[PDB]
Design an enzyme around this catalytic site. Structure first.
Site, PDB file in Angstrom:
ATOM      1  N   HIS A 729       0.963  -1.145  -0.030  1.00 45.38           N
ATOM      2  CA  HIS A 729      -0.133   0.047   0.209  1.00 45.38           C
ATOM      3  C   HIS A 729       0.783   1.472  -0.036  1.00 45.38           C
ATOM      4  O   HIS A 729       1.545   1.544   1.075  1.00 45.38           O
ATOM      5  CB  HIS A 729      -1.045  -0.026   1.214  1.00 45.38           C
ATOM      6  CG  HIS A 729      -1.968  -1.075   1.108  1.00 45.38           C
ATOM      7  ND1 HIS A 729      -3.338  -0.744   1.307  1.00 45.38           N
ATOM      8  CD2 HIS A 729      -1.823  -2.589   1.034  1.00 45.38           C
ATOM      9  CE1 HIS A 729      -4.234  -1.790   1.066  1.00 45.38           C
ATOM     10  NE2 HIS A 729      -3.151  -2.743   0.990  1.00 45.38           N
ATOM     11  N   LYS A 738     -11.750  -1.493   6.198  1.00 43.77           N
ATOM     12  CA  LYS A 738     -12.809  -2.795   5.942  1.00 43.77           C
ATOM     13  C   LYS A 738     -13.706  -2.952   7.052  1.00 43.77           C
ATOM     14  O   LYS A 738     -14.420  -4.072   7.105  1.00 43.77           O
ATOM     15  CB  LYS A 738     -11.859  -4.050   5.830  1.00 43.77           C
ATOM     16  CG  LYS A 738     -10.872  -4.240   4.725  1.00 43.77           C
ATOM     17  CD  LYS A 738     -10.083  -5.431   4.947  1.00 43.77           C
ATOM     18  CE  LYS A 738      -8.972  -5.258   5.886  1.00 43.77           C
ATOM     19  NZ  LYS A 738      -8.040  -6.603   5.913  1.00 43.77           N
ATOM     20  N   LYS A 755       2.137  -6.165   2.428  1.00 40.20           N
ATOM     21  CA  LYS A 755       1.152  -7.299   2.892  1.00 40.20           C
ATOM     22  C   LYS A 755       2.315  -8.169   3.424  1.00 40.20           C
ATOM     23  O   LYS A 755       3.307  -8.682   2.621  1.00 40.20           O
ATOM     24  CB  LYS A 755       0.322  -7.556   1.975  1.00 40.20           C
ATOM     25  CG  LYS A 755      -0.455  -8.899   2.196  1.00 40.20           C
ATOM     26  CD  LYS A 755      -1.123  -9.162   1.162  1.00 40.20           C
ATOM     27  CE  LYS A 755      -2.104 -10.445   1.352  1.00 40.20           C
ATOM     28  NZ  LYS A 755      -2.627 -10.468   2.800  1.00 40.20           N
ATOM     29  N   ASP A 803     -23.933 -22.944  24.819  1.00 44.83           N
ATOM     30  CA  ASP A 803     -24.501 -23.772  23.892  1.00 44.83           C
ATOM     31  C   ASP A 803     -24.249 -23.332  22.456  1.00 44.83           C
ATOM     32  O   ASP A 803     -24.532 -22.227  22.246  1.00 44.83           O
ATOM     33  CB  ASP A 803     -25.813 -24.095  24.149  1.00 44.83           C
ATOM     34  CG  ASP A 803     -26.476 -25.076  23.104  1.00 44.83           C
ATOM     35  OD1 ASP A 803     -26.079 -25.436  22.107  1.00 44.83           O
ATOM     36  OD2 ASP A 803     -27.563 -25.655  23.612  1.00 44.83           O
ATOM     37  N   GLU A 892     -21.836 -28.315  27.415  1.00 41.22           N
ATOM     38  CA  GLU A 892     -22.125 -29.744  26.619  1.00 41.22           C
ATOM     39  C   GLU A 892     -21.064 -30.687  26.874  1.00 41.22           C
ATOM     40  O   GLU A 892     -19.642 -30.332  26.683  1.00 41.22           O
ATOM     41  CB  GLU A 892     -22.423 -29.441  25.257  1.00 41.22           C
ATOM     42  CG  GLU A 892     -22.763 -30.934  24.498  1.00 41.22           C
ATOM     43  CD  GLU A 892     -23.015 -30.719  22.828  1.00 41.22           C
ATOM     44  OE1 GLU A 892     -22.990 -29.351  22.513  1.00 41.22           O
ATOM     45  OE2 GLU A 892     -23.265 -31.635  22.252  1.00 41.22           O
ATOM     46  N   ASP A1141     -32.240 -20.563  20.450  1.00 42.23           N
ATOM     47  CA  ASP A1141     -31.226 -20.864  20.509  1.00 42.23           C
ATOM     48  C   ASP A1141     -30.830 -20.417  22.083  1.00 42.23           C
ATOM     49  O   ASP A1141     -30.094 -21.210  22.675  1.00 42.23           O
ATOM     50  CB  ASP A1141     -30.162 -20.161  19.737  1.00 42.23           C
ATOM     51  CG  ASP A1141     -30.064 -20.863  18.415  1.00 42.23           C
ATOM     52  OD1 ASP A1141     -30.025 -22.025  18.231  1.00 42.23           O
ATOM     53  OD2 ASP A1141     -29.581 -20.152  17.253  1.00 42.23           O
TER      54      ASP A1141
HETATM   55 MG   LIG Z   1     -27.239 -27.116  22.288  1.00 39.48          MG
HETATM   56 MG   LIG Z   2     -31.115 -24.876  20.404  1.00 42.01          MG
END
Ligand SMILES: [Mg+2]
Ligand SMILES: [Mg+2]
Ligand SMILES: [Mg+2]
Ligand SMILES: [Mg+2]
Ligand SMILES: [Mg+2]
Ligand SMILES: [Mg+2]
Length: 1186
Positions: A729, A738, A755, A803, A892, A1141
């Site tokens: 650059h 960005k 870069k 989760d 989990e 969720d």
């Molecule tokens: Mg789950």
């Molecule tokens: Mg779920």
RNA sequence: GAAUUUCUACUGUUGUAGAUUCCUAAGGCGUUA
DNA sequence: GGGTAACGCCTTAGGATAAATATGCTAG
DNA sequence: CTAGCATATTTATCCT
């Protein structure tokens, strides 16, 4: 408050490796290049690899020569055989103790066989590389002067092989470690041998024989007393080739014999081969262009010496298929038939259904090649599922062939990758199209009768020219697809076999390496081996001149080894003069506790002698040792721990800068600078964590009471330039930002930004091992202390549940001891102190980018790295939340209790995330906290046990608890309703029996919904909970099918109440008065009505209503909780999950709450179990009163 | 088209924020052309 | 889904040392 | 023959 983790600091020691970059100072690089210390050390790498391979071959021969002469007792083999077949029973004293005893006996017998061989005496010494290896090579006839020269290059450099010899010592060991020969031959190969023995003794004794018994010794391979033969690698290979699967094998015979349903189902008894013995076993674009042009010339040519152009000759031949007789032309049965069906008719199953319904009905006598006439006859009558009454197929197969041959596109005739790739794509598309007419190999399941000469004789010779594309395409895809930079680094030695192996002042003319410090910059001097005494005699240390700070490193590495070595050596035994009583005590092992002669008085006397000897030793009395009274020592281990902890000091001596400059200029010293971007004059923000560790290594506060230790055996690497062309650059030119959330649209720099600048130039490297919590007691398992604290004091301990959501990458929920949610936030976007980053958007865009660029063959890769660099931010957030909110973390269990697929963070990534969080919480510092404040640099939190493996960690890893994520998403948050139904569909009778067990089906006049009253006791072999009342108010989304049009994975919001009303009314069922619906539903008949009713019943019980296209995903309850209110995630009150969720995280947090209740209630800690059960979890969620 | 001991996201301005245990050796499993 | 090794994961193991001791070179 | 120095190689072996 912070009282929870205040007592969980300085628990166990940790070891880590810090990496830096070495910038040569002054004439260091010039002298390094002049003396050629880089080419020499890059050639030493190849020489080291070759000599290691030669030593591996020597070890191979030694193993084959040693295990050949061993003869097992056999009676112990029979004892192990009978114990292995004593059934499951129980893990009593016998089943475990005698099992381990026999395993250890056999392993020790094998190791004794190893040791008896003469070559074992000096197999890991300088003798191996000095005499034994050259002699062994000379004995070998093939040998080679190159190998002898390579070995001779290390005749005075043997110490460089110490690590390799330590690696190769593991194989000849008694312990039950995976990297051993005895362990393998007694724990892995033998169980497979006995499994093969038992499956044989079952299958053969059944005698449904159809294979070849091979009898017409032979059977001795499977009988006992033969395991001795398969001990070596030759024996294992013989056993495998007898098993087989180019010589026929038993496994191949049994696999071929599993047919005709006599033994086909019994595939499990298949013979498993034995494990292998330990340690036993284009050019450029020009050539590609040349090959492409050669094949182009071979394809089109110039139409000389008859038409040799394959593109048009094959087209004409296929067009002439109609004239040729179809009674002898054959067709492949592979997916080519599916393609033909999909193109001719539009349905890919028409021809296969015709062949499986009209050609013949047994196992169909599946043959590889059919005949064109038979396909024509079958297609002339295929029951005409849905088409015109009469179809104008004519020669449908030949018509399709000629159509695709010429009239498909009329464009078959035709350096850049795009043109070559398009040409190749068309070419192998044509070759795949013409492949079905090709005869594969010979004698393929019979058939292959007399073929049409005039067609197939030319076709076979024409197709071989076009079949050269497959190897050409393989070569193209292998060469064209091969990362921008490279990370291969050469290890540097600077002519020293033992370099950086220690920093001790005494051992610094041998390791030839020192540290220097000036103005806060840390240097590394690696003195030339010719002048290794330059630092021995410092001319002066005047303070007026500018001075470096040479480190005076002192260490006593291991007390248990160093103290007896120094005090009981022929060179020093006269000086210390141990008494006869002390010598007898040491000889008889009375001080040691492992021996049966343990005596506290003897141990105390030895400790006193060691103290006196340390006081006598001149280099050790300078450590300022301060021991506890000898009467308080429980064993020698305490004294050794005290000596090790107090036997480490660092001091900095002042040496003139002019002396160092002269040494560097004259080439006697190679001075580098230990560099990091935090060591730059322009660095102003918070330094990297490893920079903090490095600067704390030599801190005055740290050196007052060591928390960080500078470990020896460092390494210096050299990395060559990998990126030639640079993307720079330019300066004074705006650059587009960005970050969409960044207010500043463009940035201007007064300097270039190259870069990957770190890869365009040659960079040195420096890996420094350091130790945290040097004076740590060693409570590597803090579970007992964490549980004791949680039971004793937990009125203010929160719970955190993580989760992996279906839509959200990771969801977080923090709850109290009463289940009230405090914080809900999806971790898809990480909002740090700076602008937030939409990591969900990044991954979503980059998956499309990668899948679209894969066809372009651009080796972008990433995806994995971004997802493994995303989880670091999540780990930081989790640590911050744990420290701030005084909460435990529940996750989990991916070992026993893992979930299904179709989540963004797959099982492999989630395991790495859990490992990263465990590693982070092992040593958790804050760059903002004070060094002495708990959680700071010198008082770091330790909230997790040291990580060893995924299996070793159980249901608790300190402050992290693992729970099975069974029934965590599809559960009502308000009440504890769960859909345990498994209705499925069967005939009328079972469905009527199923609907007969409902307590009361009725219609509610008020609020316009159905009530399905029942009790769980009638359904499934379980007795828990109470009677529920499933309604028809809270289930909307429904999908038709998985693929194809008119039925698809498309959501359709439907009110189950209205559909139920229509379904009941359309068969004259009356429910207006509100009467119970059990009557008139037992009318039977109209099975389709039963299917519809059952589908609505499954519809009116799904918790998670999901739409693929739109982001909305809501969980809505089918039952009320004491007030006639049905939960709905959409209209949440911030005390319940807001998303489909969020429910998983909330219920994982509730499982952790249950774990906390179990810990608190039990008074039998250090033995309590945390693995929850489904029944207990269901009772917990359905706890009536909360 | 973006600087790093190294990775990720950056421009946070010769760098910003957060991870970062490295070397060697052995073995097992999975995609496939 | 019939007896193929380039990559991609996983498991395990050693180490993160100073000092005594043997050996080669200078000197004799 | 050859006392001493310098270097390379091996060794010393806790307990949970
Ligand atoms: Mg789950
Ligand atoms: Mg779920
Ligand atoms: Mg050395
Ligand atoms: Mg920073
Ligand atoms: Mg950084
Ligand atoms: Mg980057």
């Amino acid at each position: 408050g912070p009282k929870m983790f205040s007592n969980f600091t300085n628990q166990y020691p940790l070891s880590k490796t810090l990496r830096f970059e070495l910038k040569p100072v002054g004439k260091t690089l010039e002298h390094i290049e002049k003396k050629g210390l880089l080419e020499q050390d890059e050639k030493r790498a190849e020489d080291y690899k070759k000599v290691k391979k030669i030593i591996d071959e020597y070890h191979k021969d030694f193993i084959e020569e040693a295990l050949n002469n061993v003869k097992l007792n056999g009676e112990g083999l029979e004892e192990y055989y009978e114990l292995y077949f004593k059934k499951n029973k129980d893990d009593k004293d016998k089943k475990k103790k005698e099992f381990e005893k026999i395993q250890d006996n056999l392993r020790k017998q094998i190791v004794e066989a190893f040791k008896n061989h003469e070559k074992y005496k000096n197999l890991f010494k300088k003798e191996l590389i000095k005499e034994d290896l050259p002699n062994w090579l000379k004995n070998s006839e093939d040998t080679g002067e190159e190998d002898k020269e390579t070995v001779e290059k290390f005749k005075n450099f043997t110490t460089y092989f110490t690590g390799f010899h330590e690696n190769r010592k593991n194989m000849y060991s008694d312990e039950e470690k995976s990297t051993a020969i005895a362990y393998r031959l007694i724990h892995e190969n033998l169980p497979k041998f006995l499994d093969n023995m038992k499956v044989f003794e079952k299958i053969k004794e059944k005698h449904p024989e159809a294979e070849q018994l091979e009898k017409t010794n032979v059977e001795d391979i499977f009988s006992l007393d033969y395991f001795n033969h398969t001990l070596t690698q030759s024996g294992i290979d013989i056993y495998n080739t007898i098993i087989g699967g180019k010589i026929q094998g038993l496994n191949e015979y049994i696999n071929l014999y599993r047919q005709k349903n006599n033994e086909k189902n019994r595939k499990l008894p298949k013979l498993k081969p034995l494990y292998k013995q330990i340690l036993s076993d284009f050019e450029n674009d020009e050539e590609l262009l040349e090959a492409i042009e050669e094949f182009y010339e071979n394809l089109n040519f110039s139409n000389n010496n008859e038409a040799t152009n394959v593109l048009e000759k094959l087209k004409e031949l296929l067009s002439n298929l109609a004239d040729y007789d179809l009674n002898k032309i054959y067709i492949r049965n592979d997916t080519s038939l599916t393609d033909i069906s999909q193109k001719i008719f539009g349905d890919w199953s028409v021809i296969k259904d015709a062949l499986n319904a009209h050609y013949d009905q047994k196992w169909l006598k599946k043959q590889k090649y059919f005949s064109i006439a038979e396909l024509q006859e079958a297609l002339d009558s295929y029951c005409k599922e849905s088409d015109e009454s009469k179809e104008q197929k004519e020669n449908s197969i030949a018509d399709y062939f000629k159509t695709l041959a010429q009239t498909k596109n009329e464009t078959d005739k035709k350096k850049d990758v795009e043109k070559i790739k398009a040409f190749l794509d068309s070419i192998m598309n044509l070759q795949h199209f013409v492949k079905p007419l090709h005869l594969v190999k010979g004698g393929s399941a019979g058939a292959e009768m007399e073929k049409d000469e005039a067609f197939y004789s030319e076709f076979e010779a024409l197709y071989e020219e076009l079949s050269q594309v497959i190897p050409l395409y393989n070569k193209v895809r292998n060469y064209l697809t091969q990362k921008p930079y490279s990370t291969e680094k050469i290890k540097l030695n600077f002519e020293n076999s033992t370099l950086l192996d220690g920093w001790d002042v005494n051992k610094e003319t041998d390791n030839t390496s020192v540290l220097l410090r000036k103005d806060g910059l840390y240097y590394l001097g690696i003195m030339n081996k010719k002048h290794n005494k330059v630092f021995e005699n410092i001319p002066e240390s005047n303070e007026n001149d500018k001075c470096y700070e040479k480190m005076d490193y002192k260490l006593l590495p291991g007390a248990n080894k160093m103290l007896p070595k120094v005090f009981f050596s022929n060179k020093n035994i006269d000086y210390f003069n141990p008494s006869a009583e002390i010598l007898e005590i040491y000889e008889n092992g009375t001080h040691k506790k492992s021996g049966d002669n343990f005596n506290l008085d003897d141990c105390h006397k030895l400790i006193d002698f060691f103290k006196e000897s340390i006081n006598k030793h001149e280099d050790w009395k300078k450590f300022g040792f301060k021991f506890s009274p000898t009467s308080s020592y429980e064993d020698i281990s305490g004294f050794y721990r005290e000596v090790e902890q107090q036997g480490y000091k660092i001091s900095f001596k002042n040496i003139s800068e002019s002396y160092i400059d002269e040494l560097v200029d004259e080439g006697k010293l190679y001075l580098f600078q230990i560099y990091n971007k935090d060591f730059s004059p322009y660095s102003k923000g918070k330094p990297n964590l490893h920079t903090l560790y490095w600067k704390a290594l030599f801190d005055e506060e740290n050196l007052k009471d060591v928390v960080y230790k500078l470990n020896g055996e460092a390494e210096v690497f050299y990395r060559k330039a990998s990126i030639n062309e640079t993307i720079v650059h330019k300066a004074n030119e705006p650059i587009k930002n960005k970050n969409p959330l960044n207010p500043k649209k463009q940035s201007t720099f007064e300097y270039d930004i190259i870069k990957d600048r770190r890869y365009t130039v040659d960079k040195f490297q420096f890996h420094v091992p350091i130790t945290m919590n040097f004076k740590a007691e060693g409570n590597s398992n803090i579970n007992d202390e964490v549980n004791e604290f949680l039971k004793g004091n937990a009125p203010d301990v929160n719970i955190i549940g993580i989760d992996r959501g279906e839509r959200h990458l990771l969801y977080l929920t923090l709850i109290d001891q009463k289940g009230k949610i405090v914080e809900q936030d999806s971790l898809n976007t990480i909002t740090n102190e700076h602008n937030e980053t939409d990591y969900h958007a990044l991954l979503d865009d980059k998956e499309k980018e990668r899948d679209k660029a894969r066809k372009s063959w651009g080796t972008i890769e990433n995806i994995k790295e971004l997802k493994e660099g995303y989880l670091s931010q999540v780990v930081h957030k989790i640590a911050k939340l744990m420290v701030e909110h005084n909460a435990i973390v529940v996750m989990e269990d991916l070992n026993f209790g893992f979930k299904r697929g179709r989540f963004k963070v797959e099982k492999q990534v989630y395991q790495k995330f859990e490992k990263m969080l465990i590693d982070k919480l092992n040593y958790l510092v804050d760059k903002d906290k004070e060094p002495n404040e708990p959680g700071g640099l010198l008082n770091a939190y330790q909230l997790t046990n040291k990580f060893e493996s995924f299996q070793k960690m159980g249901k608790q890893s300190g402050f992290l608890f693992y729970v099975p994520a069974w029934n965590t998403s599809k559960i009502d948050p308000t009440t504890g309703f769960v859909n345990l139904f498994h209705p499925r569909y069967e005939n009328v009778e079972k469905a009527k029996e199923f609907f007969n067990k409902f307590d009361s089906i009725r219609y509610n006049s008020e609020k316009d919904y159905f009530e399905f009253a029942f009790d769980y006791n009638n359904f499934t072999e379980k007795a828990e909970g109470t009677k529920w009342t499933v309604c028809t108010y809270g289930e909307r989304i429904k999908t038709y099918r998985n693929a194809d049009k008119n039925n698809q994975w498309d959501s359709k919001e439907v009110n189950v109440t209205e559909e139920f009303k229509n379904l009941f009314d359309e068969y004259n069922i009356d429910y207006k008065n509100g009467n119970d619906l059990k009557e008139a539903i037992l009318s039977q008949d109209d099975a389709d009505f039963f299917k519809s009713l059952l589908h609505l019943l499954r519809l009116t019980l799904q918790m998670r209503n999901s739409i693929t296209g739109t982001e909305i995903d809501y969980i809505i309850s089918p039952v009320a909780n004491e007030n006639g209110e049905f939960f709905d995630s959409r209209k949440a009150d911030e005390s319940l999950p807001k998303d489909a969720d969020a429910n998983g995280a909330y219920h994982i947090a509730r499982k952790g709450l249950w774990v906390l209740e179990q810990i608190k209630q039990t008074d039998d800690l250090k033995k309590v179990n945390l693995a929850i059960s489904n029944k207990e979890w269901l009772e917990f969620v359905q706890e009536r009163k909360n």
